[PDB]
């Protein structure tokens, strides 16, 4: 056997965190078009038999809170876990509506000892956010 | 006994330290390319091969436009970080 067992009762979860509107105090601009991404993703993963859950405009606390609760669920009848994060960000950090959350923190909720029901199962994190401020000038 | 960081896959929209492009009406370059490829190949290719297709799509078909010379005509290349232990197929 050299491929992940995908024959479990259900394909798995698919949490999509779509952040468009941020708090004035943060100084972060609205992410126009992100709804199209949230909508597109919802359909695709739906057609892949995943249990999609859309969460819009979550605060840094609500993000951790959600990830904490999702890890405490029973995934024994699930094949995988997909987590999509659409938001602003920097290297190792994604923005909640009121402040930054370091990826490492929410990622830990699913690593081995924390989420035993997903052990040996693929935990996929798809991330649409900036990772710095460099610009690629292309060539040819 | 396996590593605690094993079986993780981070599909980033852009390379380390770079900006990531999004379009006001079309959505983000990465996501729209991601979904396109999934629809067409989720039942033919292994995940890593699908993501590679996305890399090519985003890197080839997309280039930015702005009135600000600094942010004009810029490119993007997604980044795949895999710590998966096996191959992944959606069937």
């Amino acid at each position: 056997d050299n491929s992940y067992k995908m024959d479990y009762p259900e394909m798995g979860l698919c949490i999509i965190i779509n952040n468009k509107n941020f708090h004035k105090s943060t100084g972060m601009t609205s992410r126009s078009g992100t709804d199209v991404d949230a909508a597109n993703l919802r359909e695709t993963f739906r057609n892949l038999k995943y249990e999609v859950r859309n969460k819009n405009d979550l605060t840094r606390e609500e993000i951790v809170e959600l990830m904490r609760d999702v890890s405490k669920e029973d995934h024994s009848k699930r094949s995988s876990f997909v987590c999509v994060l659409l938001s602003h960000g920097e290297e190792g950090i994604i923005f909640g509506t009121n402040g930054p959350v370091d990826l490492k923190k929410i990622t830990n909720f699913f690593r081995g000892d924390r989420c035993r029901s997903l052990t040996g199962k693929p935990k996929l994190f798809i991330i649409q956010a900036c990772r710095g401020t460099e610009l690629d000038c292309g060539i040819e | 006994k396996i590593p605690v960081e094993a079986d993780f896959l981070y599909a980033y929209s852009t390379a380390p330290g770079y900006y990531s492009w999004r379009n006001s009406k079309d959505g983000s370059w990465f996501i729209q390319s991601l979904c396109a490829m999934l629809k067409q190949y989720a039942d033919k290719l292994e995940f890593m091969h699908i993501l590679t297709r996305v890399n090519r799509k985003v890197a080839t078909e997309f280039e930015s436009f702005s009135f600000d010379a600094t942010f004009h005509a810029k490119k993007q290349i997604p980044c795949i970080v895999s710590m998966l232990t096996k191959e992944l197929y959606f069937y």
Partner: peptide, 4 residues
Amino acid sequence: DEVX
């Protein structure tokens, strides 16, 4: 086009 906008950045994230």
